[PDB]
Amino acid sequence: SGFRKMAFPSGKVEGCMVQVTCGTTTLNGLWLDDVVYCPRHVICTSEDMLNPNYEDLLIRKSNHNFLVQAGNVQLRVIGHSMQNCVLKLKVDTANPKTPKYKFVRIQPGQTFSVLACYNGSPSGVYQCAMRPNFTIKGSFLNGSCGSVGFNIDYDCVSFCYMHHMELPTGVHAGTDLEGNFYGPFVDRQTAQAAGTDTTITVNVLAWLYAAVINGDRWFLNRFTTTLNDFNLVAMKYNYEPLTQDHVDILGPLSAQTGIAVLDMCASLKELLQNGMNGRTILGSALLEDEFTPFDVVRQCSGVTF
Amino acid sequence: SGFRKMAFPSGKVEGCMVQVTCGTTTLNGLWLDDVVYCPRHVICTSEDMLNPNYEDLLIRKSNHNFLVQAGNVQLRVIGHSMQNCVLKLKVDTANPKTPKYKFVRIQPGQTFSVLACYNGSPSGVYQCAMRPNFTIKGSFLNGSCGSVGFNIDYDCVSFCYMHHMELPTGVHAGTDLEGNFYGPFVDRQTAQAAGTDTTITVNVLAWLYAAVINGDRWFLNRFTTTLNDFNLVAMKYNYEPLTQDHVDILGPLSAQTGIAVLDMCASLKELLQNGMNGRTILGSALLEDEFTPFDVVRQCSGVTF
Ligand SMILES: O=C(NC1CCNCC1)c1n[nH]cc1NC(=O)c1c(Cl)cccc1Cl
Ligand SMILES: O=C(NC1CCNCC1)c1n[nH]cc1NC(=O)c1c(Cl)cccc1Cl
Ligand SMILES: [Cl-]
Ligand SMILES: [Cl-]
Ligand SMILES: [Cl-]
């Protein structure tokens, strides 16, 4: 028993991280097969970031201007191209540690692990969720760009995020591995403010199921509700609307615990209206929303990789 | 910016995890050089755990009764011995992935990363602290015994914990890698209750420094205090006493932020007496105490491995 904010084992991704330097800018790249993926603003100086024309800045770059370093060994770049907001650097050596992998574009509310890196070296690993406003609340310092977010399915790494920028409010924005930003954000040092960071209702409900499974139950009440009535309450509290799709996804957790989904919604509704009254749930004094129903099933059953 | 509960990259330890089966009990072992470390209660059935005599149970075991499996490959056991509450299984093959490593016995309040494993396969990674009552609040299911806790220093893995047991209250107990339990706990399915789980004051202060560095500052007040006066308040709230050693350890964070240590203590004192008033600090509604001062410096500076 016990429930922790848990990231995937990072070894498979550690073996993919390299350093990319262009001029005086150094960040991280992802080395899969004979291609290194990195943010395209590696070609930018701090000056260029104010208003970059990436196509023009790229005319001035050749393969040999991209210094790729794997540990203590330099990689030979034999080609480069820009795809949306990432560069793909073709190298003459296939990464011998390439895992089985996929590129996936996740939806808001979905979770993933981040391997924070600096100069191509792994610094730490932590769990994140794509927020409803398409930011993530990560831990990134200057030099962490190119760090990736990922999920693992047994032996297949699904890369879903590459870090690119920090907004003035300290939240973070990035792309999928095809170089498309999540949300409306751009790799340009300008005014771009995040929208409302609503709470991921389906994840809160899954985490309440995790609590019940682990013995925290003071919050279970004598009530039930309906989707429409609950969402009226969820709206007032800046909670995402709960759909029947979400209800269906929570089915297995409902079956395991014998608590109907709408009953747990009624318990959540009271928690929102009454508050925690100084109590905690799984060691938290606020309702956690960065565990998916799949994360809960995974951690409560012992899935491995 | 941003501050996350962050574990070390786990790859170096993933390459050390094996499966150990004795009779019908399967758990995890740690393969370093030509030795596999695992909990000695691998020799026990669920029946033996009620009152085991490990020396007697071991008379009935031979090298070939310990099945060690690394991925899909069996390892040949050429010797075994019991050291305190761990078994050391000598194998004829040195682990080719052995990292630079040390065995360390940590103190309460110190933090480490856990690689939760099942059947020798990594399941997830998360960050823990040795609680003042010598339990840890982990995420362990049946089969996770032998999972280890560790810190990394650049390239040297310091193993400090091996998981052995779950107490009736759902907290967890284990040993260092020499097989000595942390605290008074024993590998025996009996009545052993944890003492008071006090809050790690020095870690809370470090985490408040982390918050200031990241822009959360509403809690900074106009007050200061003394060690003695603060500890009078800390006692009432089941906070560990703050020592001058702790003050010294917080020195660097004090210097970086220009906030004297006793001033931050005065801010903490008001938070304890007044509460959070529904506010949050670094996305938490309670005071976090599983970041050490070293963890904060590490994450805020970008140390890598
Ligand atoms: O999350 C899903 N699959 C996991 C991806 C990572 N590997 C494991 C499978 C998934 N598959 N179909 C729908 C979803 N997810 C959701 O509908 C969802 C949830 Cl559950 C929570 C928050 C937002 C969203 Cl969109
Ligand atoms: O934590 C320490 N070192 C780290 C070990 C892990 N690798 C990095 C170095 C350390 N070295 N000397 C004293 C300490 N720690 C403490 O005094 C302490 C703190 Cl700081 C917080 C809570 C409890 C305790 Cl005992
Ligand atoms: Cl452009
Ligand atoms: Cl004994
Ligand atoms: Cl909290």
Short mmCIF file of N, CA, C and O in Angstrom, two decimals, chain A residues 30 84 139 207 239 246-247 276 291 304:
data_model
loop_
_atom_site.label_atom_id
_atom_site.label_comp_id
_atom_site.label_asym_id
_atom_site.label_seq_id
_atom_site.Cartn_x
_atom_site.Cartn_y
_atom_site.Cartn_z
N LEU A 30 17.62 14.66 -28.27
CA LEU A 30 17.12 13.30 -28.10
C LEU A 30 17.61 12.48 -29.28
O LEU A 30 17.23 12.76 -30.42
N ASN A 84 8.55 22.05 -38.07
CA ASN A 84 7.81 22.89 -37.13
C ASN A 84 8.83 23.56 -36.21
O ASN A 84 9.71 24.28 -36.71
N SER A 139 10.00 21.63 -13.67
CA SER A 139 11.15 22.14 -12.93
C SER A 139 12.26 22.25 -13.96
O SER A 139 12.97 21.27 -14.21
N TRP A 207 -7.71 9.74 -8.22
CA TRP A 207 -6.88 9.83 -7.02
C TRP A 207 -7.70 9.58 -5.75
O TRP A 207 -7.16 9.05 -4.77
N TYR A 239 -13.28 23.50 -12.26
CA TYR A 239 -13.00 22.11 -12.55
C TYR A 239 -13.44 21.81 -13.97
O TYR A 239 -14.48 22.29 -14.40
N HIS A 246 -15.26 9.99 -19.39
CA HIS A 246 -14.51 9.92 -18.14
C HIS A 246 -15.12 8.87 -17.22
O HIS A 246 -14.40 8.04 -16.63
N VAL A 247 -16.45 8.90 -17.07
CA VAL A 247 -17.15 7.93 -16.22
C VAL A 247 -16.78 6.53 -16.66
O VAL A 247 -16.46 5.67 -15.84
N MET A 276 -11.38 20.82 3.12
CA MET A 276 -10.74 19.70 3.80
C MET A 276 -10.85 19.78 5.32
O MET A 276 -10.59 18.78 6.00
N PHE A 291 -2.78 12.43 -11.36
CA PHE A 291 -2.82 10.99 -11.55
C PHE A 291 -3.99 10.68 -12.47
O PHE A 291 -5.14 11.01 -12.13
N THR A 304 5.06 -3.40 -14.45
CA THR A 304 6.50 -3.20 -14.58
C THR A 304 6.88 -3.04 -16.05
O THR A 304 6.04 -3.14 -16.95
#
